Design a protein around this ligand. Structure first.
Ligand SMILES: Nc1ncnc2c1c(I)cn2[C@@H]1O[C@H](CO)[C@@H](O)[C@H]1O
Ligand code: NA
Length: 328
């Protein structure tokens, strides 16, 4: 049955919590235990209050995200289809209580410095249920790194890492991410020169450029095992297909066109659509500390531009990884 918050966030861990992100879903905090940072995602469930302007999910509605988190985390320890490019899942708990005052303090600090679009989560009663997901800390999102990357060479490593992770998940799980906006691509420093993956038993490497990429946020994702499909049915959602002002919002429409509004089906072209949106961000919105000033950098730019104009003619991330010249 549900545990108190203190089960997940013993005092010292709660005292070290800093807010790092948010969405309509709820709140994300960073903390530390056994000298290791972790990210804690907290989602209210089962209650009647609007939270951030939206109804709370039921436990049945939140289960897909929990299941998908686990399956993608487990890919780091598999053999035939192996990738560390998702995000590690450490634990999941169902908690009952009002929001901890120490988390309110962290929430207020973020509101003061960065500003929040959410409600201050101070209105929950002591019977409120939450899902608390503890993840590996994955670094900083690509959107927050808009002005922080070295060069377009780094962009190439990032797109290769994303494409490989998505391909491995296609092959093992018939996975579609379905919401891979640039807030959901995390970057962390690595001392490894090369990152390793295995796709259908064939192992390969990717030069890191000093960064390891982690894909997060499985709210809209789909996968299947042995014919049992886990997904978010958005066929009757209005608002998801009516956004404007960013190619992101076109991707939701383009996915609905590809799948004829049947969200249980497998359409791995959606992963190609998201990779095209990310490549577009790399070329149009990211700005690098070092431009392509030399001939050999102008070449990497030309190859990423060629990827942008050709990739929509590939059927899946697997097709892109295996056949696109960018990755040869
Ligand atoms: N595991 C993690 N490690 C680091 N940061 C994380 C996570 C999960 C989420 N975030 C941050 O919170 C924002 C909202 O999902 C994301 O956009 C992102 O900024
Ligand atoms: Na990862």
């Amino acid at each position: 049955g549900p545990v108190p918050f203190s089960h997940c966030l013993p005092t010292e861990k709660l005292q070290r919590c800093e807010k790092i992100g948010e969405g309509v879903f709820g709140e994300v905090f960073q903390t530390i235990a056994d000298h290791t940072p972790v990210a804690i995602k907290i989602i209210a469930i089962e209650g009647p209050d609007l939270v951030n302007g939206s109804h709370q999910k039921t436990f049945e509605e939140i289960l897909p995200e929990i299941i998908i988190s686990k399956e993608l985390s487990l890919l780091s320890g598999e053999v035939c289809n192996r990738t560390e490019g998702f995000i590690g899942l450490n634990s999941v708990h169902c908690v009952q209580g009002s929001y901890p005052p120490l988390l309110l303090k962290a929430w207020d600090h973020y509101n003061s410095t960065k500003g929040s679009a959410n409600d201050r989560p101070d209105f929950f009663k002591d019977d409120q249920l939450f899902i608390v997901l503890e993840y590996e800390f994955g670094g900083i999102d690509l959107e927050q790194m808009r002005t922080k990357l070295s060069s377009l060479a780094t962009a190439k490593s990032i797109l290769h890492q994303l494409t490989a992770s998505l391909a491995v998940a296609e092959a093992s799980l018939r996975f579609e991410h379905r919401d891979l906006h640039w807030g959901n691509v995390l970057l962390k420093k690595t001392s490894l020169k090369k990152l390793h993956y295995t796709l259908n038993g064939k192992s390969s490497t990717i030069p890191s450029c000093g960064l390891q990429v982690s894909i997060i946020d499985y709210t809209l994702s789909r996968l299947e095992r042995d014919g049992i499909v886990v997904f978010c049915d958005v066929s009757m959602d209005e608002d998801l297909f009516t956004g404007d002002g960013d190619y992101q919002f076109d991707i939701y429409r383009l996915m609905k066109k590809e799948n004829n509004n049947r969200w249980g089906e497998y359409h791995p072209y959606s992963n190609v659509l998201w990779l095209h949106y990310l490549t577009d961000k790399m070329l149009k919105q990211m700005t690098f500390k070092t431009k392509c000033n030399t001939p050999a950098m102008k070449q990497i730019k030309r190859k990423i531009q060629e990827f942008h104009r050709t990739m929509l003619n590939f059927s899946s991330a697997t097709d892109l990884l295996c056949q696109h010249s960018l990755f040869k």
